[PDB]
């Protein structure tokens, strides 16, 4: 592993220092349908004219980005995305901007969000959960080795591809950082205690979030929930977790070590780093090399009927893309 990661860090660094810009333009794509909306922008299914390929195009209204003070975050998202390269990471193909918007064109993952399948089916069996978990583990091992923190793990940001494997999307809150950071950002149910308590945090938060994900997948609901975010923070800070009867002994053991309020004891943040997790009982039957190579038998494979099929995504109110005649926020987004 240390042999492989070393080569990855090199390609990453070259692109991190000298990012690509303006690799396409709006008129090369035919907008088809919205695949999803977010606190920030919308993602549409588009078709590239010259090639005929489908892509998912994320659209960001510059003015909205500014109002919400997400300038630096948007710049991180684009800079990081265009530099990373991993099997379980969504791939950025092109990126550009016009007078009103910022655009990121990625590979289209037609399998739908893990969110929809998880909520339709109820919950995933442990072997099923483990399959997904393993992919996130390797993914976090890659990201963290480059000094990156994800900060927004959740089923809504995980896509299922044609082979049944995961593709992590949305690097909205991703940040390259050595040492600690302080931004209060993420989704309430997934926030680590360090965040809520405003004490400065590191990579460790991603590991806690993995704990919430695994729990949500196996139980069918998150470990901490309520009707208002404030009530949720109280639960997370107390550290009181209750497990479903059907949860195996091994799973409960892993979880207790990931949902550990004391970041000096939290798995992933100890001396052996990612190995405490990989070597844990719950993952004993997991062949790590097999999953990285995608040679494993996917437990669930979504049904898609040809290219362009959006049947695995919910329908959304279509909204017309507006391009002002005047350039908006030119200086702020120069490097984009």
């Amino acid at each position: 592993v240390k042999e492989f990661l070393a080569k990855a860090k090199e390609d990453f660094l070259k692109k991190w220092e000298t990012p690509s810009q303006n690799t396409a333009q709006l008129d090369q794509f035919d907008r088809i349908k919205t695949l999803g909306t977010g606190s920030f922008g919308r993602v549409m299914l588009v078709k590239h004219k010259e090639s005929g390929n489908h892509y998912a195009m994320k659209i960001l209204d510059k003015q909205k980005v500014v109002k919400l003070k997400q300038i630096e975050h948007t710049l991180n998202e684009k800079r990081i995305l265009q530099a990373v390269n991993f099997p379980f990471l969504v791939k950025l193909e092109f990126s550009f901007k016009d007078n009103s918007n910022l655009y990121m064109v990625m590979e289209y993952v037609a399998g739908g969000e893990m969110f929809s399948h998880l909520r339709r089916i109820g919950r995933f069996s442990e072997p099923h959960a483990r399959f997904y978990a393993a992919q996130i583990v390797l993914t976090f091992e890659y990201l963290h080795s480059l000094d990156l923190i994800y900060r927004d793990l959740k089923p809504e940001n995980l896509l299922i591809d044609q082979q049944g494997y995961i593709q992590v999307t949305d690097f909205g809150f991703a940040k390259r950082v050595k040492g600690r950071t302080w931004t209060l950002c993420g989704t309430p149910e997934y926030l680590a205690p360090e965040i809520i308590l405003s004490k400065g945090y590191n990579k460790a938060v991603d590991w806690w979030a993995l704990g919430v994900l695994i729990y949500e997948m196996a139980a069918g609901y998150p470990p901490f929930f309520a009707d208002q975010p404030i009530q949720i923070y109280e639960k997370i800070v107390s550290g009181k977790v209750r497990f479903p009867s059907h949860f195996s002994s091994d799973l409960k053991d892993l979880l207790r070590n990931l949902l550990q309020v004391d970041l000096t004891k939290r798995f992933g943040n100890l001396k052996n780093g990612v190995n405490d997790i990989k070597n844990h009982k719950w993952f004993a039957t997991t062949d790590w090399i097999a999953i990285y190579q995608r040679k494993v038998e996917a437990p669930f494979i979504p049904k898609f009927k040809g290219p362009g099929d959006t049947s695995n995504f919910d329908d959304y109110e279509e909204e017309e893309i507006r391009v002002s005649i005047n350039e908006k926020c030119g200086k702020e987004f120069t490097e984009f």
């Binding site: 969110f115 959740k154 909205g172 209060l184 993420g186 989704t187 309430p188 069918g220």
Partner: peptide, 20 residues
């Protein structure tokens, strides 16, 4: 049950981020 309490809460749909 916990499941019934979850399904009755107002947070079963797509959850949005919280920011600075």
């Amino acid at each position: 049950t916990t499941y019934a309490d979850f399904i009755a809460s107002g947070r079963t749909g797509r959850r949005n981020a919280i920011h600075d």
